[PDB]
Amino acid sequence: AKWNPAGARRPVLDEAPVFYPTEEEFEDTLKYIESIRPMAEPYGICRIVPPSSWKPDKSIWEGSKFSTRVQKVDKLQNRKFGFEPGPEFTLQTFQKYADDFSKQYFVPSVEDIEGEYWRIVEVPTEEIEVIYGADLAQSGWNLNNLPRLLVPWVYVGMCFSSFCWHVEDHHLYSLNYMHWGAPKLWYGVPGKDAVNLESAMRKHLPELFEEQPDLLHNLVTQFSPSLLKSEGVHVYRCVQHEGEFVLTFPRAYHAGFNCGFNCAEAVNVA
Ligand SMILES: O=C(O)CCC(=O)C(=O)O
Ligand SMILES: [Fe+3]
C-alpha cells in the first residue's frame, strides 16, 4: 500500500554502545571481543565500526541464485504458520524488485522507515508483504575464518524484511557484518533480561503461546520495543550500516528489520 508519516510509532530507546577499535586492537577479533565484553555485555548488543585500514563480481551478482521466504509484516505481532516460500532471485533481480517496492511504498530517513515499520506491526491498516533470502585477512572479521580460531550464513534483506525476536542456539554470540546496501536496525536485550522479555511476551500475547507453546524458538514473532519498555524491559537500538559489525552476546535477545535492499553475513561463536 503506502506510507503514513503521521501514524509513525517509532520506539523511543537508548542507543546500544558503539565501538571504534584501533588497527592494533583490530588484528585479533576474539581478543578485542573479550576486551569490550565487560562494557558491552550489559546491553546484550553492540555495534563495531572497523578502522580505516580495514577493507572488506558480475556473474555472482548476475548469476548466482537463491530462494526467499515471504513475510506478512502486518501479521508478525498481531494475529489470531510462518514464512511460506517465495520466488527465486539473483542479487540483481532481487534488488530491482526490492527498490521498486520501496519507491512505491514511500527518499525516507531510517527513522521514517522505523516509524512506519512499527506502525505496520503494531497497528496495520493494510496487508503488506515482503521477501527475504536467509541462510544462504586472515583475521576473524572475515567470518569464514572464525569457526577455526558452525559456519557463516548469508542474508539478503529488503525494506521491512525482519528477523524476529530470539536468542542464539546455545550460549553463543553471533557476529554480523553488512557487506552492502541499506541500513539494518537492531534491537537488543541483555541476557539478564531474558526473563522479563519472555514473561512480557507471554503476558501480552497469551493466545499464541497457547496455540504454539514454542513460539520463542520459531523466529516468527516480532514484538514492539515500546511494549517491552512498558514492562520494564531494557531494549537497545542499534543501526548497522554497510561495512559495520553488530555483535550479539550470549543469552541476549535480538530482533530487527532492514531499511532496504542489503546483503549481510553472520556466524555464531563462543
Ligand atoms: O538477519 C537474520 O536474518 C538473522 C539473524 C540472526 O539469527 C543472527 O545472525 O543473529
Ligand atoms: Fe540471531
Numbering used by the authors: 139 to 194, 200 to 223, 262 to 287, 296 to 325, 350 to 362, 378 to 498
Provide excerpts from the study:
The crystals belonged to the P63 space group with a slight change in unit cell parameters among the three crystals. The unambiguous electron density denoted Fe(II) (determined by inductively coupled plasma mass spectrometry) bound to c-JMJ703 and identified the active site within the JmjC domain. Three key residues, H394, E396, and H482, are perfectly conserved in JMJD2 proteins. They chelated Fe(II) in the active site through their hydrophilic side chains. Our data indicate that although most of the JMJ703 residues in α-KG/NOG stabilization showed a high structural similarity with JMJD2 proteins, the residues Y321 and N404 displayed specific features. Y321 and N404 showed significant conformational shifts compared with their counterparts in c-Rph1 and c-JMJD2A. The conformation of Y321 in c-JMJ703 indicates that the residue may not be in direct contact with α-KG or NOG.
In this work we have identified a rice histone demethylase, namely JMJ703, which specifically demethylates methylated histone H3 lysine 4. Our results demonstrate that JMJ703 is essential for plant cell division and stem elongation and specifically demethylates mono-, di-, and trimethylated H3K4 in vivo and in vitro. Finally, the fragment spanning amino acids 139 to 498 (termed c-JMJ703), covering the JmjN and JmjC domains, was deemed to be suitable for crystallographic investigation. The c-JMJ703 molecule presented a canonical overall folding of JMJD2 proteins and contained four of the five domains defined in the structure of c-JMJD2A: the JmjN domain (A139-K199), the long β-hairpin (D200-T271), the mixed domain (L272-V377) and the JmjC domain (L378-A498).
